[PDB]
Ligand binder design. Structure first.
Ligand SMILES: OC[C@H]1O[C@@H](O)[C@H](O)[C@@H](O)[C@@H]1O
Ligand code: NA
Length: 441
């Protein structure tokens, strides 16, 4: 029935998806400015140039969080605002902005859970190979140092990266995200330098921090299940689970990269000496899990790597873009708790997209998103019952925003955003979370 009295209850955003003001106050160009302004990369012709205008309107966002009765806010700092050339001088105006926002949050009783990297690499680094270069890892750590030096007296809970799987594989292998490259080896290289940048940043942050910090990383985990028990389908399930989950979990847990995946990738695998793996395993205080979906895998010998395709289940509900499988959240947490060293855990994202509209009465009747929260929160109670050391939950997203290659067309918010007027309105699911949280707090 109940969560811990000190549980963290929040919603989450990322800077490029919400802030707009892309050229204001010294902000540099990010790979997502370049990519979103490249014809055809975004589905609907939109960019993050305005987005939710949260650079100017984070006060309104704070208003929503307050109305929701939350006690925490997960957001990202734009590297392009802080070090506009990527490696070079800081931009004090960038840091001052986030300093005021942090003060605003704390004054409202909202604990800032800051993400340092949620995909907006400065374009000057990409011009020197981006995550294809080990130098990018070094200058990421420098950036992590600068930020914590200035805001670490107030922010205790930091995440280095959000979802390196996406940054590496969507960004450099499949080409669907910025910067838009299409080479496996480049993707795997990028995964390594992300992980290294992570490890280097943790160490830098601990040395720069004016007080002890609780430092984590955020991974999206996709629990994977074989469509049948055939050696073929089981193998496919393993390969997918390795491609998405274990590739990151293992080296973070000090276990190296998974040998099966090393064998599968062959010459495409990155060059990973033992000093880098030691750095990548820098001790963490927590792990963030982003959870959206499962993968029910059939072998797909003719598809590209990892030769494993989703077997649709028409009995399960689907959202605008995903199948709903709440039981996967219990499953992956049970696996983390029993099989890996990370603890405590936070659900740093969970939510869904729907064809939301403002109805005649003025509300947004998103009952399927309410049912989505209710079901996933129920699985978290089960996970807690089994001893999973879960300390918080953040809904993705606080508000409808720029959904990457889908643009402004794919609405994930618990608040509706009118992108013309910038008015936000709380959806019915948001009111349900309010009332649920108020019962738990
Ligand atoms: O697609 C929904 C969400 O997925 C997550 O993996 C990312 O961290 C978000 O930035 C994105 O908005
Ligand atoms: Na549906």
């Amino acid at each position: 029935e109940r969560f811990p009295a000190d549980f963290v209850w929040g919603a989450a955003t990322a800077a490029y998806q919400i802030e707009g003001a892309v050229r204001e106050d010294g902000r540099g160009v990010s790979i997502w400015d370049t990519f979103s302004h490249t014809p055809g990369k975004i589905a609907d012709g939109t960019t993050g140039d305005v987005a939710c205008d949260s650079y100017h309107r984070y006060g309104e966002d704070i208003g929503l969080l307050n109305a929701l009765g939350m006690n925490a806010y997960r957001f990202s700092i734009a590297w392009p605002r802080i070090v506009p050339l990527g490696a070079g001088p800081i931009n004090q105006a960038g840091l001052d902005h986030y300093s005021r926002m942090v003060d605003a949050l704390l004054g409202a009783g909202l604990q800032p859970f800051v993400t340092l990297y949620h995909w907006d690499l400065p374009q000057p680094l990409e011009d020197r190979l981006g995550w294809g270069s080990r130098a990018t890892a070094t200058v990421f750590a420098e950036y992590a140092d600068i930020v914590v030096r200035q805001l670490g007296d107030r922010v205790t809970h930091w995440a280095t990266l959000n979802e390196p799987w996406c940054s590496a594989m969507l960004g450099y292998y499949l080409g669907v995200h910025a910067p838009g490259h299409t080479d496996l080896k480049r993707g795997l290289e990028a995964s390594h330098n992300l992980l290294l940048g992570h490890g280097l940043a943790v160490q830098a942050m601990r040395a720069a921090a004016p007080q002890p910090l609780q430092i984590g990383i955020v991974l999206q985990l996709t629990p994977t299940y074989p469509a049948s028990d055939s050696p073929e389908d089981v193998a496919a399930a393993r390969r997918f689970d390795g491609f998405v989950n274990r590739w990151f979990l293992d080296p973070l847990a000090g276990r190296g990269y998974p040998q099966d995946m090393l064998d599968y990738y062959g010459a495409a695998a990155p060059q990973a000496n033992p000093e880098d793996l030691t750095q990548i395993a820098a001790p963490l205080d927590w792990l963030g899990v982003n959870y959206y979906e499962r993968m029910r895998a059939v072998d797909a010998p003719d598809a590209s790597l990892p030769q494993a395709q989703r077997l649709d289940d028409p009995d399960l509900p689907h959202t605008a873009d995903r199948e709903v499988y709440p039981e996967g959240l219990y499953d992956i947490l049970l696996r983390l708790h029993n099989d890996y060293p990370f603890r405590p855990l936070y659900i740093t994202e969970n939510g869904c997209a729907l064809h939301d509209e403002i109805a005649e009465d003025g509300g947004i009747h998103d009952g399927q998103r309410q049912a989505f929260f209710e079901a996933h929160l129920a699985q978290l109670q089960r996970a807690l019952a089994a001893g999973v050391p879960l300390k918080g939950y953040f809904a993705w997203s606080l508000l409808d925003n720029f959904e990457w290659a889908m643009g402004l067309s794919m609405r994930y918010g618990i608040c509706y955003t009118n992108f013309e007027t910038l008015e936000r309105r709380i959806k019915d699911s948001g009111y349900w979370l309010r009332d649920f949280i108020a019962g738990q707090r």
